[PDB]
DNA sequence: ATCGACCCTATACGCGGCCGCCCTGGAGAATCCCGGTGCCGAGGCCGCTCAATTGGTCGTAGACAGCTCTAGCACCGCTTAAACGCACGTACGCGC
């Protein structure tokens, strides 16, 4: 459902396949864990244990994510 | 034998001197601007030629309509796995 509102908002009265959404999920979620995993990093080099926005952030921001 | 007076010493204070801490002017580099100079790369013109242009023919990918058949959407109900909220407290964030 959350794809569905995405797509609304670039193109109208549009149909997915199941197999479509499948795949948005498995490459989102692997970006996630993968971004956690940078983040958890982070949080780490700061002598913390937490992880928080600035980690994120930070992670995104050596990746070149603007 | 005892009391008063005098001298000596210890102590207290009194203020003076010295030190440490807290607030402003000014000195000196390092930077920006500026007028003179000067030089070498930019911008321009010259002329050559090869790539763009043009006119033309042949063919096929593609536009288009027609038909069909998968699968994407809608709906619904039952179960329950999972999600939400609240309570507690301990160990982790962070400030020093």
């Known amino acids: 459902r959350l794809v569905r509102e995405i797509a609304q908002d670039f193109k109208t009265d549009l149909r997915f396949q199941s197999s479509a959404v499948m795949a948005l999920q498995e490459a989102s979620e692997a970006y996630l864990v993968a971004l956690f995993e940078d983040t958890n990093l982070c949080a780490?080099?700061?002598?913390?244990?937490t992880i928080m926005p600035k980690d994120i952030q930070l992670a995104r921001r050596i990746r070149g994510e603007r």
């Open 44 to 49: 780490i080099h700061a002598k913390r244990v």
